[PDB]
Design a protein around this ligand. Sequence first.
Ligand code: W6P
Length: 167
Amino acid sequence: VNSFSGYLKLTDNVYIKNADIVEEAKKVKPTVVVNAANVYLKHGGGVAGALNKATNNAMQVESDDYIATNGPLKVGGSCVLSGHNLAKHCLHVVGPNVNKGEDIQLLKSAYENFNQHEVLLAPLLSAGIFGADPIHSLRVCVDTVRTNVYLAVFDKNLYDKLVSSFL
Ligand SMILES: O=C1Cc2ccccc2N1
């Protein structure tokens, strides 16, 4: 049993809810929250900007030190950093950004990072300002992630379309 409430069950392991991931993280304090990161861990907008704002910029400060030591992530890659006030850990995952011309086949590699964690609160990778089709992102998620994933979808309209169209 876990703390996640109000989710619709899509599969054995994937759950979905219309929710602000920031407000959900604050309520649940999950072991892992996933950030929709870029390779530079520059948390300007989208999910990353919202998560970082909720940490009062402490996520960005920590991220800048990580990049200064390790250099950029790979598209499809990830790193584990602090969850600050939102979670125990933040898994920063880089999905391909279609608005930069990245290979959408890298979305499966991105989701494979989730399998290193038994339970996660996450957004749909490469959705929103990353430019991918969220319906496709949900399909790759279900077909790739084997661990227990709780997806937060900010937009109610999109949430209802994801559920109604789910095979
Ligand atoms: O609110 C939103 C923003 C967006 C981008 C692409 C597809 C669906 C949606 N819903």
